[PDB]
Amino acid sequence: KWPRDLRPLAHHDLLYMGQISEEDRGDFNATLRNFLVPRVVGSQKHREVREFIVRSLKDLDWDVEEDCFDGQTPHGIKPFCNVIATLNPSACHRLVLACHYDSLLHKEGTFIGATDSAVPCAQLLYLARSLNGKLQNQKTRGDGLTLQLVFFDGEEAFERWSSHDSLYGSRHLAQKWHEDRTSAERLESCLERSEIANQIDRMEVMVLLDLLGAENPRFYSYFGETQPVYRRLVNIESRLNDAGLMELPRRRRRTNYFSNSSTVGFIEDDHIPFLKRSVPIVHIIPSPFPDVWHTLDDNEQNLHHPTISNLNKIFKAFVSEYLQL
């Protein structure tokens, strides 16, 4: 059983999280435009993207940390900088939403990585912005739960994906947090039977978004441990559809992104170094990958906007339910 009682979103809140005004659309797209540039490790546009993320979240009065370091790669020594934003640093437990902000250095030409992961980056910032008032209110409760957003650097391989060439930022951060010791007594309102020995134990669940923005994604539950959390995403999507709040190409259709079916697939991503340290993971990545995956066609025009809108409604409702906004 999940360590936190997961109370179903009231209808009033579901309906609110499920509407998207044209200024909602406009705000998200304006956010997204900042990420639809090549973001290769070490580059100027990469530092500009990080600066944008940092300022956006500092403007919202979040605590923002830049976890920077240099690491050896097949292309020589490289600088990396993870961005960690925490709404209430004192709160013992974090609901962590994450993605990567670097883009693949593509051998053929300029690679935008619109789904991989410009859309997930923008979705995290859009969540922070659009739920800001509710989040600021939730932070005052002293209930020991907060929201945390991690934008990992160096997710992509420089050459052939391997244990040593991939996940530079997440490998670094998981180790950093594992070795940084702390205890429940130093923290605000930890749950009763919490075993807190280090920073990594404060990660209540890590929801990792990746390869989003293409039409008709298929998600599955990748971890039995987080099946209670995963099923809330299934339930929210079902309720949005029942209420007629999803955008579909024709009348009398339903989205079915979050399957209840079992899968036996394994995908390496930024969750791995945390998974190895007992952090519960929900991996929101489609299977199969978008047809555009790691091609020069993973670009702005190939994004499917109605799907992005539907996903934003699900994620907003999810956060709202988890934090009881």
198 to 147, 166, 168, 203, 275: CA distances (angstroms): 18, 25, 21, 10, 15
The piece of 42-50, 108-116, 145-153, 302-310 that touches Fe ion (CB under 5 A) is 108-116
The residue (of 17 and 112) whose beta carbon lies closer to Fe ion is 112
Burial per residue of 148-163, b for 16 or more beta-carbon CB atoms within 10 angstroms, e otherwise: bbbbbbbbbbbeeeee
The piece of 113-121, 215-223, 274-282, 313-321 that touches Fe ion (CB under 5 A) is 113-121
The residue (of 116 and 204) whose beta carbon lies closer to Fe ion is 116
Maximal CA-CA distance, the chain: 55
The residue (of 68 and 105) whose beta carbon lies closer to Fe ion is 105
The piece of 36-44, 59-67, 86-94, 115-123 that touches Fe ion (CB under 5 A) is 115-123
The residue (of 116 and 237) whose beta carbon lies closer to Fe ion is 116
The piece of 75-83, 90-98, 116-124, 233-241 that touches Fe ion (CB under 5 A) is 116-124
Under the criterion CB under 5 A, does residue 116 sit at the interface with Fe ion?
A: yes
Under the criterion CB under 5 A, does residue 298 sit at the interface with Fe ion?
A: no
Query: Under DSSP, is residue 215 helix (H, G, I), strand (E, B) or coil?
Result: coil
Any known ligand binding at 294? yes
Q: Amino acid identity, residue 196? A: I
Q: Least CB distance from residue 294 to Fe ion, whole Å?
A: 6
Phi, psi (rounded to 5 degrees) for 97: -110, 140
Q: Least CB distance from residue 237 to Fe ion, whole Å?
A: 25
Q: Are the beta carbons of 256 and 29 closer than 8 angstroms?
A: no
* Selection from 177, 178, 179, 152 nearest residue 167 by Cα: 152
Q: Which residues pair with 81 in a beta bridge?
A: 68
Any known ligand binding at 116? yes
Consecutive H or E run containing 176: helix 168-179
User: Which residues are catalytically annotated?
Assistant: 155, 210
Residues contacting Fe ion: total by CB under 5 A: 1
Residue with the shortest CB distance to Fe ion = 116
For residue 288, whether the previous peptide bond is cis, meaning omega lies within 30 degrees of 0, is yes
d(CA 44, CA 55) in angstroms, rounded, equals 16
Q: Least CB distance from residue 314 to Fe ion, whole Å?
A: 22
Under the criterion CB under 5 A, does residue 269 sit at the interface with Fe ion?
A: no
Q: Least CB distance from residue 295 to Fe ion, whole Å?
A: 11
d(CA 15, CA 7) in angstroms, rounded, equals 16
Q: Least CB distance from residue 118 to Fe ion, whole Å?
A: 11
Q: Which residues are annotated as a binding site for Zn(2+)?
A: 116, 156, 294
Residues that bind Fe ion (CB under 5 A): 116
